[PDB]
């Protein structure tokens, strides 16, 4: 009863961070060693759980969130961080119990002339609540004017595109991120190891 992990990690395309994807994992067994024993990952921090213990612990349902950001922003995917990504795109709760996995994906997500399919949110009237997905495309009002659905002076379209090129500096290169969330409600647990 294998859990669909190669689905999440080996997916052809990844989601933009503002429209981050979430896959629920339920009613299956999963080996976490086939993951945390890979040297391919550039980042593997865990919170509220020993990664080694994951093979013998068991949880209600598991959430796998995935998206693309640029390298310098990977540090923002952590409990209690601030910045453009942590505030307007994807925010972790301070009580976060799970693991954050990230690896460079310049060979998949960079394109000659620039891959503009990956977007992030530059402006938002307020900070995101944890695990909130804001896909609003209405125009930001940075001044006092009513933009009437068109962009002008201090009337900004809130989403902006990464220009991922193969020659970008490593800090501006695309990174694929997967966030595993583990919750233990009072409902029966259906995701455990061997």
């Amino acid at each position: 009863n294998l859990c669909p992990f190669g689905e999440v990690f080996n997916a052809t395309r990844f989601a933009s961070v503002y429209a981050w994807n979430r896959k629920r994992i339920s009613n299956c067994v999963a080996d976490y060693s086939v993951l945390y024993n890979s040297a391919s990952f550039s980042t593997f921090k865990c919170y509220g759980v020993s990664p080694t213990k994951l093979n013998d612990l068991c949880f209600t349902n598991v959430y796998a969130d995935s998206f693309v950001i640029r390298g310098d922003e990977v540090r923002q995917i952590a409990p209690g961080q601030t910045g453009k990504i942590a505030d307007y795109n994807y925010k972790l709760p301070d009580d976060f119990t799970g693991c954050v996995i990230a690896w460079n994906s310049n060979n998949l997500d960079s394109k000659v002339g620039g891959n503009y399919n990956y977007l992030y949110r530059l402006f938002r009237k307020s900070n995101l609540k944890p695990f909130e997905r804001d896909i609003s495309t209405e125009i930001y009002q940075a001044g006092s004017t009513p933009c009437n659905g068109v962009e002008g002076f201090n009337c900004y379209f809130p989403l902006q595109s990464y220009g991922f090129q193969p020659t970008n500096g490593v800090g501006y290169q695309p990174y694929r991120v997967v966030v595993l969330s583990f919750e233990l409600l009072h409902a029966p647990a259906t995701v455990c190891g061997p």
Partner: antibody
Amino acid sequence: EVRLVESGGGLVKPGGSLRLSCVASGFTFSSYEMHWVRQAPGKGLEWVSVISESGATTHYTDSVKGRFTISRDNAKNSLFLQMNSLRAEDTAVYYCTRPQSVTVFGVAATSYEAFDFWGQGLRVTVSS
Amino acid sequence: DIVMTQSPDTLSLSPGETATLSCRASQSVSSYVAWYQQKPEQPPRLLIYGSSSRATGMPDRFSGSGSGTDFTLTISSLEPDDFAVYYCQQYTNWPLTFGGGTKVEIKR
């Protein structure tokens, strides 16, 4: 003039550790991502490590991941390679390397193509 | 990891002739290839980037061509200074990889 003065190499026993330092001058150090490349005796060139301008992003070749750590102090124009649990195959001449910027005008993301400047090299000998 | 195979290992030529050095990649790297010269006890010197673009101050007898997986460095009218080791490098796929090198030796 662009200059990269290197220091901190030399002799070590297997399982030992070193810290290579590279002080930059003649250019804006904080605007450049920086690399370490190495060359074993009689062998060719092997890329080792890269760090972004801010230092928030680092990347390593697989044979040194988890043992080597690249870092930088932009206030002191300094680049460092910390080498732990050194192995015999880590013996080489080590170069700090500045890649060539091709960032056009005022785009936010930097772009680089090849290595346009190299330090003189530090000998690192790991032997019993 | 992309392997950069240089060929041949040695060319034996005299001054005034033309050196043609080949580099082949195990998969496509578009035009993201560079060529360096190395002399004994010195760091490498960048000669060509972007497959065909000369570094600042390179003589025009150095020229580069190719794309995808096939790349060539041509040194026209070899001078006594040009007899050295030459490396190709791809610089967009991690880890960055260099070719094994080609030595241009004096013919006799």
